[PDB]
mmCIF file of C-alpha atoms in Angstrom:
data_model
loop_
_atom_site.group_PDB
_atom_site.id
_atom_site.type_symbol
_atom_site.label_atom_id
_atom_site.label_comp_id
_atom_site.label_asym_id
_atom_site.label_seq_id
_atom_site.Cartn_x
_atom_site.Cartn_y
_atom_site.Cartn_z
ATOM 1 C CA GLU A 279 113.279 157.130 124.020
ATOM 2 C CA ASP A 280 113.872 153.039 123.891
ATOM 3 C CA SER A 281 114.771 153.351 127.470
ATOM 4 C CA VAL A 282 112.860 150.907 129.611
ATOM 5 C CA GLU A 283 112.239 153.551 132.377
ATOM 6 C CA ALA A 284 111.038 155.607 129.289
ATOM 7 C CA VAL A 285 108.487 153.141 128.084
ATOM 8 C CA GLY A 286 107.276 152.144 131.483
ATOM 9 C CA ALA A 287 107.108 156.125 132.053
ATOM 10 C CA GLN A 288 104.667 156.119 128.927
ATOM 11 C CA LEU A 289 102.750 153.215 130.154
ATOM 12 C CA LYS A 290 101.960 154.798 133.368
ATOM 13 C CA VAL A 291 100.527 157.835 131.534
ATOM 14 C CA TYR A 292 98.401 155.985 129.479
ATOM 15 C CA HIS A 293 96.996 153.733 132.012
ATOM 16 C CA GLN A 294 95.980 156.881 134.019
ATOM 17 C CA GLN A 295 94.221 158.381 130.880
ATOM 18 C CA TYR A 296 92.519 155.152 130.873
ATOM 19 C CA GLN A 297 91.331 154.740 134.144
ATOM 20 C CA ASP A 298 90.288 158.464 134.180
ATOM 21 C CA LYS A 299 88.172 157.908 130.883
ATOM 22 C CA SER A 300 86.779 154.781 132.420
ATOM 23 C CA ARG A 301 85.601 156.243 135.745
ATOM 24 C CA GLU A 302 84.240 159.210 133.722
ATOM 25 C CA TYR A 303 82.302 156.795 131.842
ATOM 26 C CA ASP A 304 81.067 155.096 135.063
ATOM 27 C CA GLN A 305 79.868 158.375 136.490
ATOM 28 C CA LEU A 306 77.846 159.017 133.017
ATOM 29 C CA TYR A 307 76.490 155.272 133.284
ATOM 30 C CA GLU A 308 74.921 156.036 136.733
ATOM 31 C CA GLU A 309 73.579 159.345 135.663
ATOM 32 C CA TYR A 310 72.047 157.844 132.853
ATOM 33 C CA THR A 311 70.363 155.032 134.722
ATOM 34 C CA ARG A 312 69.339 157.207 137.765
ATOM 35 C CA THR A 313 67.688 159.757 135.423
ATOM 36 C CA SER A 314 65.870 157.017 133.933
ATOM 37 C CA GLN A 315 64.581 156.035 137.203
ATOM 38 C CA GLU A 316 63.282 159.738 138.062
ATOM 39 C CA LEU A 317 62.123 159.309 134.446
ATOM 40 C CA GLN A 318 59.943 156.493 135.503
ATOM 41 C CA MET A 319 58.111 158.319 138.313
ATOM 42 C CA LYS A 320 57.172 160.875 136.064
ATOM 43 C CA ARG A 321 55.580 158.583 133.721
ATOM 44 C CA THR A 322 53.664 157.140 136.851
ATOM 45 C CA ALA A 323 52.802 160.466 138.197
ATOM 46 C CA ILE A 324 51.289 161.573 134.520
ATOM 47 C CA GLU A 325 49.199 157.953 134.801
ATOM 48 C CA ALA A 326 48.021 159.360 138.497
ATOM 49 C CA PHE A 327 46.527 162.523 136.820
ATOM 50 C CA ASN A 328 45.097 160.703 134.028
ATOM 51 C CA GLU A 329 43.532 158.556 136.472
ATOM 52 C CA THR A 330 42.371 161.424 138.821
ATOM 53 C CA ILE A 331 40.902 163.340 135.798
ATOM 54 C CA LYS A 332 39.275 160.173 134.609
ATOM 55 C CA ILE A 333 37.527 160.083 138.084
ATOM 56 C CA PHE A 334 36.433 163.553 138.152
ATOM 57 C CA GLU A 335 34.990 163.464 134.893
ATOM 58 C CA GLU A 336 32.868 160.278 136.194
ATOM 59 C CA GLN A 337 31.571 162.298 138.933
ATOM 60 C CA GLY A 338 30.774 165.235 136.547
ATOM 61 C CA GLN A 339 28.798 162.792 134.447
ATOM 62 C CA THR A 340 26.653 161.416 137.475
ATOM 63 C CA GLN A 341 25.797 164.706 138.991
ATOM 64 C CA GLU A 342 25.061 166.072 135.544
ATOM 65 C CA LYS A 343 22.464 162.968 135.214
ATOM 66 C CA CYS A 344 20.784 163.864 138.464
ATOM 67 C CA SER A 345 20.883 167.768 137.799
ATOM 68 C CA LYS A 346 19.238 167.560 134.226
ATOM 69 C CA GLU A 347 15.595 166.636 135.552
ATOM 70 C CA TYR A 348 15.790 169.400 138.332
ATOM 71 C CA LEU A 349 17.770 171.755 136.148
ATOM 72 C CA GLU A 350 15.308 171.451 133.088
ATOM 73 C CA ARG A 351 12.456 172.088 135.419
ATOM 74 C CA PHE A 352 13.764 174.694 137.454
ATOM 75 C CA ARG A 353 14.448 176.562 134.186
ATOM 76 C CA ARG A 354 10.689 176.757 133.311
ATOM 77 C CA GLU A 355 9.515 177.123 137.043
ATOM 78 C CA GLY A 356 11.561 179.372 136.740
ATOM 79 C CA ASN A 357 13.853 179.198 140.059
ATOM 80 C CA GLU A 358 17.004 181.608 139.460
ATOM 81 C CA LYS A 359 18.835 180.891 142.487
ATOM 82 C CA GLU A 360 18.264 177.126 142.710
ATOM 83 C CA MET A 361 19.451 176.285 139.232
ATOM 84 C CA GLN A 362 22.333 178.724 139.745
ATOM 85 C CA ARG A 363 23.447 176.777 142.374
ATOM 86 C CA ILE A 364 23.525 173.613 139.881
ATOM 87 C CA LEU A 365 25.622 175.373 137.169
ATOM 88 C CA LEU A 366 27.953 176.731 139.864
ATOM 89 C CA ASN A 367 28.771 173.116 140.593
ATOM 90 C CA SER A 368 29.360 171.782 137.525
ATOM 91 C CA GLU A 369 31.565 175.076 136.928
ATOM 92 C CA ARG A 370 34.253 174.657 139.806
ATOM 93 C CA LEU A 371 34.075 171.111 139.049
ATOM 94 C CA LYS A 372 35.071 171.444 135.474
ATOM 95 C CA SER A 373 37.411 174.267 136.511
ATOM 96 C CA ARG A 374 39.130 171.822 138.821
ATOM 97 C CA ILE A 375 39.467 169.164 135.931
ATOM 98 C CA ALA A 376 40.639 171.883 133.254
ATOM 99 C CA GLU A 377 43.070 172.874 135.799
ATOM 100 C CA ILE A 378 44.507 169.453 136.715
ATOM 101 C CA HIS A 379 44.503 168.617 132.954
ATOM 102 C CA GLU A 380 47.062 171.592 132.461
ATOM 103 C CA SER A 381 48.794 170.663 135.545
ATOM 104 C CA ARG A 382 50.110 167.398 134.017
ATOM 105 C CA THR A 383 50.950 169.050 130.740
ATOM 106 C CA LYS A 384 53.581 171.110 132.380
ATOM 107 C CA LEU A 385 55.005 167.631 133.808
ATOM 108 C CA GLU A 386 54.802 166.333 130.211
ATOM 109 C CA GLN A 387 56.959 169.056 128.884
ATOM 110 C CA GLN A 388 59.240 168.929 131.780
ATOM 111 C CA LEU A 389 59.314 165.132 131.334
ATOM 112 C CA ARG A 390 60.521 165.242 127.457
ATOM 113 C CA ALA A 391 63.219 168.033 128.858
ATOM 114 C CA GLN A 392 64.524 165.242 131.135
ATOM 115 C CA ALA A 393 64.069 162.434 128.268
ATOM 116 C CA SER A 394 66.201 164.587 125.905
ATOM 117 C CA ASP A 395 69.050 164.823 128.691
ATOM 118 C CA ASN A 396 69.271 160.859 128.856
ATOM 119 C CA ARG A 397 69.330 160.778 124.949
ATOM 120 C CA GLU A 398 72.302 163.192 124.974
ATOM 121 C CA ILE A 399 74.045 161.598 128.057
ATOM 122 C CA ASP A 400 73.540 158.108 126.285
ATOM 123 C CA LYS A 401 75.239 159.875 123.336
ATOM 124 C CA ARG A 402 78.285 161.210 125.216
ATOM 125 C CA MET A 403 78.349 157.858 127.037
ATOM 126 C CA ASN A 404 78.704 156.022 123.448
ATOM 127 C CA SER A 405 81.517 158.808 122.312
ATOM 128 C CA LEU A 406 84.015 157.089 124.907
ATOM 129 C CA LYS A 407 83.313 153.546 124.158
ATOM 130 C CA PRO A 408 85.760 153.820 121.130
ATOM 131 C CA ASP A 409 88.610 155.569 123.134
ATOM 132 C CA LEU A 410 88.336 153.242 126.107
ATOM 133 C CA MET A 411 88.901 150.104 123.773
ATOM 134 C CA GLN A 412 91.752 151.915 122.163
ATOM 135 C CA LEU A 413 93.468 152.796 125.528
ATOM 136 C CA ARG A 414 92.933 149.540 126.975
ATOM 137 C CA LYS A 415 94.659 147.716 123.886
ATOM 138 C CA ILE A 416 97.470 150.369 123.935
ATOM 139 C CA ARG A 417 98.082 150.057 127.674
ATOM 140 C CA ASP A 418 98.064 146.203 127.259
ATOM 141 C CA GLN A 419 100.597 146.540 124.520
ATOM 142 C CA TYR A 420 103.264 148.356 126.764
ATOM 143 C CA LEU A 421 102.702 145.790 129.137
ATOM 144 C CA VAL A 422 103.784 143.138 126.762
ATOM 145 C CA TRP A 423 106.383 145.120 125.516
ATOM 146 C CA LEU A 424 107.914 145.949 128.994
ATOM 147 C CA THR A 425 107.062 142.311 130.014
ATOM 148 C CA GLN A 426 109.243 140.651 127.028
ATOM 149 C CA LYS A 427 111.892 143.630 127.985
ATOM 150 C CA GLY A 428 113.943 142.854 130.955
ATOM 151 C CA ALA A 429 111.602 145.291 132.666
ATOM 152 C CA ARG A 430 109.426 143.441 135.422
ATOM 153 C CA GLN A 431 106.832 143.246 138.218
ATOM 154 C CA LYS A 432 107.549 145.627 141.034
ATOM 155 C CA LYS A 433 108.100 148.460 139.069
ATOM 156 C CA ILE A 434 105.178 147.619 136.620
ATOM 157 C CA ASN A 435 102.949 147.847 139.495
ATOM 158 C CA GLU A 436 104.333 151.243 140.366
ATOM 159 C CA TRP A 437 103.372 152.323 137.129
ATOM 160 C CA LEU A 438 99.779 151.142 137.575
ATOM 161 C CA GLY A 439 99.546 152.836 140.868
ATOM 162 C CA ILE A 440 98.983 149.469 142.768
ATOM 163 C CA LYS A 441 99.705 149.184 146.652
#
């Protein structure tokens, strides 16, 4: 009721709630920053693929340049096996590229998944900011109350779990 022990008893309850609400928030904040890091690597990895692919395409372009003379000629010569070789190269090459291009696409999809999670963890992270403010305010109020009350230090520390 109006018992100092009863008020201090209430204080302990709210302070605890507050610390717990606070700890949980901290846990989320780390998780958010951490995932934003792992999210960076993914972005970087994608650039790696983009770079890799851009490379192979340049290789393809230049080999295609030299092949063109020979190929156009072997066609009318007409050497089957020789020009066959030429097409077989460009093929496996383009099926290396076409293979990688899809390989990053799976990562991009895999990326947006994590990106959403951060959007959501950030959301939950904002749900708590209000309560934290309030609990802190509240707890501070009981402190002032008990403080102006005869109630005093040592037991206050007890109620705040201080050693």
